[PDB]
Amino acid sequence: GGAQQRELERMAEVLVTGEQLRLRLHEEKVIKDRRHHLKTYPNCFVAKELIDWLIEHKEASDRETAIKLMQKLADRGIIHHVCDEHKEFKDVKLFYRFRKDDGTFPLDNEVKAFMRGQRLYEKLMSPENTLLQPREEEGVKYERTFMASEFLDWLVQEGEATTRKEAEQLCHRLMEHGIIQHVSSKHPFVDSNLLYQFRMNFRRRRRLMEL
Amino acid sequence: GGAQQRELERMAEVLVTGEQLRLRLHEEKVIKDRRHHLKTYPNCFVAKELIDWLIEHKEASDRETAIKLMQKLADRGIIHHVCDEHKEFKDVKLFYRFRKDDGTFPLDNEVKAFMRGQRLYEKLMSPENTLLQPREEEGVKYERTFMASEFLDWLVQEGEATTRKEAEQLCHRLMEHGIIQHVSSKHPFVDSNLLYQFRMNFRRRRRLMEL
Phi, psi of B102 (to 5 degrees): -60, 150
Closest by CA to A149, choosing from A167, A175, A137, is A167
Resolution of the PDB structure in angstroms:
1.9
Cα–Cα distance for residue pair B187/B119, rounded to 1 Å:
24
**What are the angstrom distances between the C-alpha of B121 and each of B3, B44, B124, B198?**
20, 32, 5, 8
Closest by CA to A72, choosing from B88, B31, B159, B144, is B88
Chain-chain contact of A96 with B47 (C-beta, under 8 angstroms): yes
Point out which residues pair with A81 in neighbouring strands: B96
Alpha carbon B94 to chain centroid distance? 37
Buried b (16+ CB within 10 A) or exposed e, B23-56: eebeeeebbeebeeeeeebebbbbbeebbebbee
Cα–Cα distance for residue pair B146/B162, rounded to 1 Å:
20
Q: CB under 8 Å to B142, separation ≥6 — which residues?
A: B134, B135, B136, B183, B195, B197
Cα–Cα distance for residue pair A80/B42, rounded to 1 Å:
17
Cβ-contact A21, A208 below 8 angstroms: yes
Cα–Cα distance for residue pair A123/B86, rounded to 1 Å:
39
Domains of chain B in start order, with CATH, are 3-106 (1.10.10.10), 109-198 (1.10.10.10)
Closest by CA to B146, choosing from B157, B137, B158, B159, is B137
**What are the angstrom distances between the C-alpha of A182 and each of A81, A112, B9?**
46, 21, 51
Q: What angle do CA B180, B186, B189 make, to 5 degrees?
A: 45
Cα–Cα distance for residue pair B17/B76, rounded to 1 Å:
12
Type and span of the H or E element at A75: helix A63-75
Cα–Cα distance for residue pair B149/A66, rounded to 1 Å:
60
Neighbour count for residue A37 (Cβ, 10 Å): 5
Alpha carbon B1 to chain centroid distance? 19
Residue B78 per-residue DSSP state: S
Cα–Cα distance for residue pair B165/A88, rounded to 1 Å:
46
3-state SS, residue B112 = helix
Cα–Cα distance for residue pair A69/A46, rounded to 1 Å:
15
| Gyration radius (Cα) of chain A, Å | 22
Output the DSSP codes for A143-165.
EEEEEHHHHHHHHHHTTS-SSHH
What are the chain A neighbours of B95 within 8 Å (beta carbons)? 34, 36, 41, 44-46, 81-82
In total, chain A counts a number of residues equal to: 211
Cα–Cα distance for residue pair A67/A50, rounded to 1 Å:
10
Cβ-contact B202, B159 below 8 angstroms: no
Cα–Cα distance for residue pair A66/A132, rounded to 1 Å:
39
Cβ-contact A69, A60 below 8 angstroms: yes
**B47 lies within 8 A of chain A by CB:** yes
> Torsion angle of alpha carbons B45, B47, B49, B53, nearest 10°?
90
Experimental technique used? X-ray
**Burial (CB count <10 Å: 0-12, 13-18, 19+), residue A141:** exposed
Pairing of strands A95-98, A133-137: unpaired
Type and span of the H or E element at A10: helix A2-27
Among chain B residues, the shortest Cα distance to A104 is held by: B99
Cα–Cα distance for residue pair A50/A47, rounded to 1 Å:
5
Residue B183 per-residue DSSP state: T
CA distance A28 to chain B (A): 15
**Burial (CB count <10 Å: 0-12, 13-18, 19+), residue B101:** middle
Point out which residues pair with B136 in neighbouring strands: B141
Interface-testing mutation among B98, B107, B162, with chain A (most A C-beta atoms within 10 A):
B98
**A71 lies within 8 A of chain B by CB:** yes
**What are the angstrom distances between the C-alpha of B142 and each of A36, A192, B153, B200?**
63, 48, 21, 16
Q: Which of residues 80-99 of B touch A (CB under 8 A)?
A: 80-99
